[PDB]
Amino acid sequence: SVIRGLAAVLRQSDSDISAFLVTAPRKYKVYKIPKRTTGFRVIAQPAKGLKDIQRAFVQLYSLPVHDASMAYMKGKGIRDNAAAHAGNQYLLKADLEDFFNSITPAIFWRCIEMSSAQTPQFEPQDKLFIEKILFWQPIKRRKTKLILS
DNA sequence: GGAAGCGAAAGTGTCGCAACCCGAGAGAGGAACGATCTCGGGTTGCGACACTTTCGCAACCCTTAATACGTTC
């Protein structure tokens, strides 16, 4: 079903979407961006074909997001985030470690299962395709390690 | 995640020294052997240190990226 939806949006055949997705987790270009002090960050960008599929997926399936989440939200940004705290005198900042690379298919599916608000329902057959759409395989030899980039 | 080279940490084995034991031997005391002391060789316990083994830092960025200027993750 996910495949049919994507094929319709991208005006492609079910077969060509399915074929592309077989090795989608490996279709990432890896490069370095300089840090502002010394050193580099390593970035993995999906190939163009995969980016299109990923955008289509996000368009087709609305996942719930809390109002406290300020990043990547339409009409919100760093100004809104800062303004939320401007009237208070005491401040605490905390950070999550390796945030994106900590999110695995296992976490994703657990969150789907646990979620209070109306999550899209996926057929078991679609779960494998979704994993291939959303998660990157950093290590060629280790097919079992999929993470968000 | 983890190349290649490197060294920290930690466990094990080696080996040389000191202390001890043993029998051999020249020959004090005084006039018959053999007292006392030292040579030379062997054993055993000890502990400092050499040797061995494992771990972990982080090169590379995989065929697969985009290019109007800034900010944030």
Side-chain angles (χ1 to χ4, degrees), chain A residues 9-142:
Chain A
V9 167
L10 293 170
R11 309 195 338 293
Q12 291 182 46
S13 73
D14 62 74
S15 299
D16 43 40
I17 297 293
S18 176
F20 184 87
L21 287 178
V22 168
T23 59
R26 293 287 312 139
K27 293 183 169 133
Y28 284 72
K29 180 60 171 176
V30 177
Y31 58 88
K32 300 190 320 176
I33 65 166
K35 288 183 146 289
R36 288 178 176 165
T37 49
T38 47
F40 297 99
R41 293 180 175 279
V42 172
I43 303 294
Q45 207 186 134
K48 292 162 73 71
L50 183 51
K51 285 191 284 178
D52 294 338
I53 295 172
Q54 286 178 352
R55 288 180 191 127
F57 178 85
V58 161
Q59 278 280 279
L60 283 168
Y61 300 101
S62 60
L63 292 160
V65 47
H66 192 279
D67 288 345
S69 311
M70 296 296 207
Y72 319 122
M73 290 304 290
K74 226 73 70 61
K76 297 216 269 201
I78 64 163
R79 209 235 285 119
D80 300 74
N81 190 38
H85 301 281
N88 294 332
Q89 71 186 307
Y90 309 112
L91 188 69
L92 172 67
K93 218 287 284 194
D95 184 81
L96 300 170
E97 285 184 357
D98 305 297
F99 176 53
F100 282 97
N101 293 174
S102 298
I103 300 170
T104 60
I107 293 175
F108 173 70
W109 292 121
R110 193 195 303 118
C111 292
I112 292 282
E113 186 181 298
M114 217 51 51
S115 55
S116 57
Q118 295 176 8
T119 12
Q121 193 136 247
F122 300 106
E123 296 173 288
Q125 64 198 296
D126 289 337
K127 289 190 183 289
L128 185 64
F129 291 116
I130 293 166
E131 291 183 2
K132 291 179 177 187
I133 293 162
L134 297 177
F135 294 83
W136 169 44
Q137 186 183 319
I139 308 142
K140 179 156 80 76
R141 291 174 40 63
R142 185 136 87 250

